[PDB]
From Swiss-Prot, chains A, B, C:
The keyword Transferase is annotated on this UniProt entry: yes
Binding site for UDP-alpha-D-glucose: 188, 194, 310, 489, 491-492
Gene name of this polypeptide: GYS1
Modification sites for Phosphoserine: 391
Job description of the protein: Glycogen synthase participates in the glycogen biosynthetic process along with glycogenin and glycogen branching enzyme. Extends the primer composed of a few glucose units formed by glycogenin by adding new glucose units to it. In this context, glycogen synthase transfers the glycosyl residue from UDP-Glc to the non-reducing end of alpha-1,4-glucan.
Residues of the full protein shown: 18 to 625 of 737
Pathway: Glycan biosynthesis; glycogen biosynthesis
Tissues where this protein is expressed: Expressed in skeletal muscle and most other cell types where glycogen is present.
EC number: 2.4.1.11
Protein name, per record: Glycogen [starch] synthase, muscle
Keyword annotations of the record: Allosteric enzyme, Diabetes mellitus, Disease variant, Glycogen biosynthesis, Glycosyltransferase, Phosphoprotein, Transferase
Species, as recorded: Homo sapiens (Human)
Amino acid sequence: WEDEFDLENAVLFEVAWEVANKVGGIYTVLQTKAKVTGDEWGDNYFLVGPYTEQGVRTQVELLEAPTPALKRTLDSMNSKGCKVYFGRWLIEGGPLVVLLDVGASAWALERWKGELWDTCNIGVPWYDREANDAVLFGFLTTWFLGEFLAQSEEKPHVVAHFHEWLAGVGLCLCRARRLPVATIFTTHATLLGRYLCAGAVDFYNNLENFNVDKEAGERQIYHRYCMERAAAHCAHVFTTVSQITAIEAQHLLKRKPDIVTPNGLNVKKFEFQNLHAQSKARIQEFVRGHFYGHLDFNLDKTLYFFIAGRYEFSNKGADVFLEALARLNYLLRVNGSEQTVVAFFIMPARTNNFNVETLKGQAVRKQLWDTANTVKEKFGRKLYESLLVGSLPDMNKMLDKEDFTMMKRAIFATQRQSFPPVCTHNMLDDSSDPILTTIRRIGLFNSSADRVKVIFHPEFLSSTSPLLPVDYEEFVRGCHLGVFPSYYEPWGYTPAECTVMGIPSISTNLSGFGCFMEEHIADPSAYGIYILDRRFRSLDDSCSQLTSFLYSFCQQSRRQRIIQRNRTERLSDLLDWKYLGRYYMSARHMALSKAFPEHFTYEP
Amino acid sequence: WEDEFDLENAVLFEVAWEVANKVGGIYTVLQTKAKVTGDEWGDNYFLVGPYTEQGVRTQVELLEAPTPALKRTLDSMNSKGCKVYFGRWLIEGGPLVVLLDVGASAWALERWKGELWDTCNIGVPWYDREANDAVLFGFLTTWFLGEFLAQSEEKPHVVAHFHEWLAGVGLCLCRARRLPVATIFTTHATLLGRYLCAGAVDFYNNLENFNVDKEAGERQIYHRYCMERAAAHCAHVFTTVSQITAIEAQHLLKRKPDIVTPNGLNVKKFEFQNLHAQSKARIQEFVRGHFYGHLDFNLDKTLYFFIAGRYEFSNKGADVFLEALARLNYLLRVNGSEQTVVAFFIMPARTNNFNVETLKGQAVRKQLWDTANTVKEKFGRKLYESLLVGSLPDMNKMLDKEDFTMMKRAIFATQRQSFPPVCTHNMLDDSSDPILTTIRRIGLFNSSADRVKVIFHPEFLSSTSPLLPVDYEEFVRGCHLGVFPSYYEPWGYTPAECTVMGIPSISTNLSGFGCFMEEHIADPSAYGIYILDRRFRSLDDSCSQLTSFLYSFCQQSRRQRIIQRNRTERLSDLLDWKYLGRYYMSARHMALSKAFPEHFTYEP
Amino acid sequence: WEDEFDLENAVLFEVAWEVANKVGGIYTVLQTKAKVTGDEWGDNYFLVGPYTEQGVRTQVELLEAPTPALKRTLDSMNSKGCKVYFGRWLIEGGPLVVLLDVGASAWALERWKGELWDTCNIGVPWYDREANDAVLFGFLTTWFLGEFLAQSEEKPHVVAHFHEWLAGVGLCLCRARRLPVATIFTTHATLLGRYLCAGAVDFYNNLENFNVDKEAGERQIYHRYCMERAAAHCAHVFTTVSQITAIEAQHLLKRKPDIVTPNGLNVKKFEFQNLHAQSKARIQEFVRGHFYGHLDFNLDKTLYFFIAGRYEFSNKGADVFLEALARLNYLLRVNGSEQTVVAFFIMPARTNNFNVETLKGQAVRKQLWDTANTVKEKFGRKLYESLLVGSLPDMNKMLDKEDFTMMKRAIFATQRQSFPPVCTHNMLDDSSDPILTTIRRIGLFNSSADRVKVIFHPEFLSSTSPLLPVDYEEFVRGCHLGVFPSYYEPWGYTPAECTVMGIPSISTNLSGFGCFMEEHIADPSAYGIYILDRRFRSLDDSCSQLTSFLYSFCQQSRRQRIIQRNRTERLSDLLDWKYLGRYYMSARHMALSKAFPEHFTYEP
């Protein structure tokens, strides 16, 4: 937005446990949003966070505060028993960060807990180190805000935006001390949602039939749920990153969010068919190496699907992907479609080292490539010489005995009897792995009859990997489709990165990204976004619909595939922070309107 | 040298008509020597020169003088009827230049000529614009030096180093006004030598049987010879760039030089074996294009000789090179040596445009190369596919009809009946050209029987030439030998640049570079320098000796050629200004000793 | 089409004067159509043509005929006073060609002319060498067809397809001898159309008010018009390459064509954004060099328009383009649009050599580039060293005096007072040139105020040009729009090449390509084809509409431009011979149906 709003003396503090502390996905959200928030708030934008030795040592450049009230606040809090650091976060925008050492202020924790009893009726056990750190951080942030307001010679308007429950407890203290502060609360994932969905008792179907206190007591996380509910209740403005998480919060936290604030990216034109062509060539080389001695299928009609992210079988919907892969294999075999589908499972697991067959295949492909280049280069040299002489070359003589010997060596190298391995690594738990168990149960063994090959790479893609020396971005740029049929995904960063890079993707309406693109696009499938109806269908229906999506993608010609991909690169403008920051702007404006109705007015 | 000498208040002015005015080879000498002279004289180093609009507009950054005496001098001379600029020459070292507008001070020329009559007994005609400009420049320089000495609150020691006769009239005037200045005179070429050698009356044999005044009167350059002789006689120190020019000056200028100051280069590692390989490949491609339809000789045993420089047939010894080429062709044919020698004559002449045969040959080679690459790439693709399948490839089938069609088109392109042209351009004067006349007289028509091919490129090598888009340096890096059998060459810059770039070369003892390498090397031929004995041999004997040199080079194996080239690349340390500036240092020290014997003492 | 038709014994002869004889644009049509015609007719496809020494020597591989009737025909015609060559044309498909030496059969011309009087009432003057060659070629082709039918042991069905009036006299003779042959006539341009449009008397407006015989008599081409009209009248099937030329033929040749057979291309994926980016970068470099010292405009908002083809001012509509450029310059200036438009006029003319300003600009840009790379490389080296040490670099010290000196030299090089030249060459006729006259009349002098710069390159783009070493292909790949507002263009090969390459283009409804795209596309402007209404508008209205088209293109954003370019890249499937050969197939089928109604039936 380009709204005309008053922020002359207003100051914004964005409180989050992940400021200069990468312990989740909110770190990238804050890092990317810092630029667009700075371009609007100037030097009145601060990032409260926790003090970590590693984070400061690698990311924070300690500075001297720029306003006298800020020096007075830091000095008072440092001489009153705490240790507070002021610095600049070495990211785009270089926002000023106010880091707090929670451990150095632990000596008051017990007394502070008493305060938490006297205002909020919230108690925390001693053994919850994470919750005790959250309590310390919240008290430190509230004390910082109060001291900053006290030391200001002219009292400004403070907007405190707390992210998640870890940073949210201070919000309660901001409301229990009548501080003139506009408090916003953002939940990037409801706390009980992960545990309830992990129970596999139809989390989304029974959202209105849950006993939240009973479930928390079963999980022994009642204090955490209570403090997040208190943060959501107390906040002036309650926002969420998605509509599905908004429903989760309405039914679990018992408050309907005021705005939904989707996560964005700093899209930077990461061309599009040049990078795709090069990456597809590299993926083709890897597939040639892996399937050496079994390359009986056309590689010009091979489609590369992929799924990535954290290795959560049920949550990421990898079982649905595998079942749909088996059904699509049957569909391709019965219909006689000469299409081949190579499905990559890039999901890190506990692995020992690289498989022997996979390394041997890569070495065999390298040897074949070297042999082909050597023979081709000397053939071209002899051909050029013959053409210069003016004679039509005789191919019965342009191969000397050395070429035949080395080609025979290559042919003997390619000889192989076993089938290509499903997994490229040695899994420490072959029996305990859900992906390998499902693959061997459904029958995808990379045989010649199978039209669907499966490659499970249980490690992060790196340029230092001997197998496939390309990182995640270059690898997935050369894939045709990304399938993310997730069940519990509050926003979904892998599908969003896939869409920003221009790859058509399959998401669900149970993910935040899927809901976002469903509500922002008239016909998502035209643009390359396929949304599964996982919220109103049984899992069998979800697998059938995913199979239909995959078969429809396979039945597309090259022309339709290219057109759809082009629409997908069009789509990336929706996911930037330039467009998606207006939701945060609106949330801050409602917070200012609610906390200071006399000075600020908001028109929704 | 690292001599301990006093230059605390001494100032050096290097007077030369070529300062910021490229009208000869002394321009590069001054430009390259400026750095090493600055690294010794600091800010007390100045470069007097003439004012040209182009030279100032592209090379001189006008500045404000750094010493009060210098401002006073410039202001007095500008307010006393002249127009003088002070600037910085935009070269390495950034020396300060004192440019003088000779035309703006022409109003005094007549009166100034009277002064030249009252002190030096030298008269100049009105029609000699060059000599009148020299007189104006000399009077301006003398006035500048006198005013600079007058305005100095503390009188310094001035060393004025004049180059060539154009700047020497200033030396004559400085000596005729008892100015406290140490004057050095350097002649880069004796004035009568060019005319006497152009007469072809055995210039070097009759050096002691010349009437200098009579020859000058015949050439009507008596005033120029008189003023150069006066400059040489008046100078405190007389130097020369070579020993052969030193003999010329001893017999013509009637004064033996005190020191010989060879020209140096700013050698910068321009071990020349990657560059040699690449440039040799490019030259091989050019020779393939030029001789298309006649490539019946082994290109792996082809030796590339070259001669370059100004197009002076007798002076540069191109006739000797051509006669030796004919004799070497006979030797190679009689001895049955399968060696081929391609001799390049890079000597600019008056030409219209590129020859049609040469352009057609380059286009034919490009088409053959494109055809070969296309067939080679698809052959390599099919070969890689066949190897991946695991089958021994069949060359009877990997060539489709398209490849046969395009190779047949290439074969029809290469068809040719005429012989390759000797010259790559269309000469406006075919009859008047000495090189083409000599080639057609001796019988080098690039026929199949001839072992010596001749390519005459009458234009400067540039990267914008469609034929051979490589400049002079890259072209001659890929040549095996450079032949410079010059007759009148005071120093010789082409052989010196050839040696700096590591190419073995043939020079003579009538050139300054040849004398330098002869006296600095125990066995020059071991290092790749072949010195013709052109001073004590008849021209037939010179041609026989050059033929022996060329045949000995041809008879060398690849091993001996590589070893000799390595030694030549060692040799380049002798030609740097780091070593060769000590001669100029010595000359300046003798000038200081002679002009100021009380303050300076010199030990030779 | 995939029609089920009988061609078991049918043989096709495609008679054209341009077979292995490049004297027009029909040569490329036949060369590209040979493949798709062979893929349907097998070895029963022949290409009659004229014998040329150059064409045979570079393109035709003489063979031995494959059918006994063909040997008997060749032997009889060679022993009966003619000389006939049988060969293979070295193109895709390698079609068999029957070349005829028209000169060697000139001895019968007089008698043959008598035959032309006895059957067709057509006379030809002696001075028309082209028409006499046409008569000889037609008689030779008719004799060849008759002898081929006679020597066939089993009489086949012959389909003779004659192209243009040069080959049509053979059609007239074939129809006058009752030969069992199905004759098709294709006109790629009506004969009187060029002369009538060159008269500028509203050729298209007065199509129904022409006296064809009177106009031919005025132009003294009555015999040629008569013979083309006879060929069109006699043919079983009359086809044309366009609907506009079909109207021309209906009103001039007095016969409505049966089918319109558009010209096609062998589209081969010649993606389209990597090439566009690289070519745009090279065009930007050229524009930087040309406008050195005047680069006061944003080059990121510069749009590259171009017009190419034969240098016909009125026919190619270059005057309309220039007037619209002036109007668009006014529109951009008044509206303050910071867009700049560089219009290239790639139209060969009679020029001496390259302009001095243009060469100087290219050299200046090269020097600036070299300076920037040198400074950048040493800066990066020093920066890497400083970062490795662990210190933040000081930019006040990373530039040594050498860098400042060489940057000052670059700055002095860029200094310029004059404006960039409009033409890059030296025109031998500055006064007689219509383009330069129009440019100086309308006021496009590449001044700073002008938003439209004009660069006139009167020479074919080749990689050997020192200015812009890129061919026409790669140069126009990097342009944004091609403007071809032609008045008389029977098909239009430049717009078709432009569209195949993926560039949006402006054509007219008076060109064949424009009519083709108009009738094959619902909204042409969406796909990047802008069709001027030059047939029903006055020239002022045409200029206004072209100005509107250009301004609408300028007002497009980058997103809309990219989308439109993607649609244009889609469009290229319409212009291939795979789709456009079905029109020729239909024409041949109607010819077979008409000539042999008992054996062949056609359903339109």
